[PDB]
Design a protein around this ligand. Structure first.
Ligand SMILES: [Zn+2]
Ligand SMILES: [Zn+2]
Ligand SMILES: [Zn+2]
Ligand SMILES: [Zn+2]
Ligand SMILES: [Zn+2]
Ligand SMILES: [Zn+2]
Ligand SMILES: [Zn+2]
Ligand SMILES: [Zn+2]
Lengths: 213, 6, 186
C-alpha cells in the first residue's frame, strides 16, 4: 500500500490514511458482516467483564485472523502501516451504527486488571479505524481532548466538541492510545458521534504491545 | 469504557 | 506530504527501507554543508536550517514520533563494530532510543552495506559483500533511508537490532542519521 497520509494531530497522535481500503474491499466486508451482527459490548473498568452498556449502541461482529483471503490482505496492510507484527493484533471487528447509535468518549486502553494482561498481548497501543461507508449526517469520530477542534460547516455539534473525522469510504484513521514511552495517552479520548442519516459501517484493528497468546 | 476484546 | 515506497525488510528486527526518502538535491545539500564542518562526523542542530527542518518534519511524520523526541542530525563520512542504539549494560535525555533513521547520501558501488547480524534472515547471492552476508543487509543508495526499531513495541530492548557498517570496497559512503527517543530530549 501507498497513499496520501494526512497528519491530523500530535496530541493525540493521529493520522488519516486516504483510500486505505478499496471500495470493493469495503463492500465485501459489510456483506460478510451483516448476518452476524449483534449488540456491541464494553468491559467494566474495574472487573474487565464484558457487558452491555448504554455507552455504546452499535452492533458488531468479529472475523478471526486469517479466516478470509480478502481480510488477510487488509490485515497485512495494517501491520505494514502500523509497523507492528500481526501477532499483536486482535481480530477484525466490524461495526454498524445507524439511527442514533453512538459510542460515547472512551479509551481503547484498558483500565481493568485482566484485559491488558500478558496473555492478552499486554496493553492496547494503536487502533486503526477503517470507514466502510460514507455517512450523510453524523457518525464522526470525535477526539475531544485534541489540541485542535473542528469548526464551520458540515460537522455536527457533537463533532465541534473536538477534532473530528467524517467517515468516508476507504479512508482509515490511525491513532495511538499510548505515548511512545508506553504511558497512557489521555489525549486519545475518542467516540463515535450519533449517526443521524446514513449507515455507518467501519472496521477496527486494535493492536497490542505484545503478542496475544 | 473500553471496547471488549477480540 | 512525502508519499513513498516502503519496502518491509524484517520483523526481527523491525526494519523498513524508504525509497527516495530524500531528493538527490537534499543529499547534495547536506553533504555540501557538512564538508567544511567535519572532524569524520558532524552535527546539525534541530531546526538549524530550512532545508534540514523540512527533512526533520518528514522523519517525524514517517516514524510517527514527534520532533521533541528527536536528536539532531548526525552526518557521517565513512573496523566492523556492530552495536545497539539503545542504552544498555554493563536514565538519559529523552529516555531510550526507539527508532533510528539512516539516510544514505551517496550510492556505494561496492561494500558499505549497513549490516544486521542478529537478524531473522541473512542476505545471499551477488551484489553482497562478505561482511554483509553476516546478516540482513542494505545497500547505500542515494536518497534511500533505513528505518529500524531498537525497542520492541512494549518498550523492551531488541538485541535483533544489532547493526554495523561494512567496509567500503568501491565508492565513498556518506550518511545522515537521526535517533529518536521515547520521550522529549528536553
Ligand atoms: Zn480503578
Ligand atoms: Zn451514556
Ligand atoms: Zn475506541
Ligand atoms: Zn487471561
Ligand atoms: Zn440503517
Ligand atoms: Zn553497546
Ligand atoms: Zn547505531
Ligand atoms: Zn570520502
Amino acid at each position: 500500500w501507498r497513499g496520501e497520509v494526512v497528519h491530523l494531530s500530535w496530541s493525540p497522535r493521529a493520522f488519516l490514511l486516504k483510500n486505505f481500503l478499496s471500495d470493493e474491499e469495503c463492500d465485501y466486508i459489510v456483506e460478510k458482516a451483516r448476518p452476524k451482527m449483534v449488540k456491541s459490548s464494553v468491559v467494566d473498568n474495574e472487573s474487565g467483564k464484558s457487558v452491555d452498556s448504554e455507552i455504546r449502541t452499535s452492533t458488531g461482529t468479529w472475523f478471526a485472523k486469517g479466516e478470509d483471503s480478502v481480510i488477510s490482505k487488509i490485515e497485512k496492510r495494517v501491520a505494514q502501516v502500523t509497523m507492528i507484527p500481526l501477532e499483536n493484533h486482535e481480530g477484525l471487528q466490524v461495526l454498524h451504527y445507524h439511527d442514533g447509535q453512538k459510542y460515547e468518549p472512551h479509551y481503547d486502553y484498558f483500565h481493568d486488571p485482566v484485559n491488558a494482561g500478558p496473555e492478552h498481548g499486554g496493553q492496547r497501543v494503536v487502533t486503526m479505524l477503517m470507514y466502510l461507508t460514507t455517512v450523510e449526517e453524523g457518525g464522526e469520530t470525535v477526539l475531544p481532548n485534541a489540541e485542535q477542534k473542528v469548526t464551520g460547516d458540515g460537522w455536527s455539534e457533537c463533532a465541534k466538541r473536538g477534532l473530528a473525522v467524517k467517515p468516508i469510504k476507504g479512508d482509515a484513521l490511525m491513532f495511538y492510545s499510548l505515548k511512545p514511552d508506553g504511558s497512557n495517552d489521555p489525549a486519545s479520548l475518542h467516540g463515535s458521534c450519533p449517526t443521524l442519516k446514513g449507515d455507518k459501517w467501519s472496521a477496527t484493528k486494535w493492536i497490542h504491545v505484545a503478542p496475544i497468546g | 469504557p473500553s471496547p471488549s476484546p477480540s
